[PDB]
């Protein structure tokens, strides 16, 4: 588990991942435009979300 | 008549989607929160562009 969601994110777009506060994530930063590609370890869903909605954990 | 600035961008936002508004840090905004999904409908007072962006990317101004 690499990251954690810090704010609620409700998708508007089909490619986006829904986040609740405190969701644990496996994620990779797409640094060309600062979106994460991620797997939500609470829901099992996949998709993208804007980078400042998550912190790195280690 | 005047409209006061409502919000200020705090993080860089680079659109992936046609309806989105590009933000640079400290950009001045006129914006209205959409409560069903916590996106703003906004006008960027620096760039003159319009579109949507996610709520955590801006603060309220006074």
Numbering used by the authors:
A (entry chain AAA): 491 to 548
B (entry chain BBB): -2 to 58, 61
What did the article's authors report about this structure?
Here we capture ring flipping events of a buried tyrosine residue in the SH3 domain of the JNK-interacting protein 1 (JIP1). Our data therefore suggest that the conformation of the aromatic ring at position 526 is determined by steric interactions dictated by the size of the surrounding amino acids.
Accordingly, we designed four different mutants of JIP1-SH3 (H493A, V517A, V517L and A541L) and obtained their high-resolution structures by X-ray crystallography. Of note, three mutants (H493A, V517A and A541L) induce a staggered conformation of Y526, with χ2 dihedral angles ranging from −41° to −75°, whereas V517L shows an eclipsed conformation of Y526 and an almost identical structure to the wild-type protein. This suggests that they are in fast–intermediate exchange between two conformations represented by the crystal structures of the wild-type protein and of the H493A/V517A variants. In agreement with this, both variants show line broadening and chemical exchange contributions as detected by 15N and 1HN relaxation dispersion. Analysis of these data shows that the structural features of the minor state of the wild-type protein are captured by the H493A/V517A crystal structures, as shown by the excellent agreement between the ΔδCPMG values for the wild-type protein and the two variants. In addition, the analysis yields exchange rates between the staggered (canonical β-strand) and the eclipsed (classic β-bulge) conformation of kEX = 2,830 ± 70 s−1 (H493A) and kEX = 6,800 ± 300 s−1 (V517A), compared to kEX = 2,600 ± 70 s−1 determined for the wild-type protein.
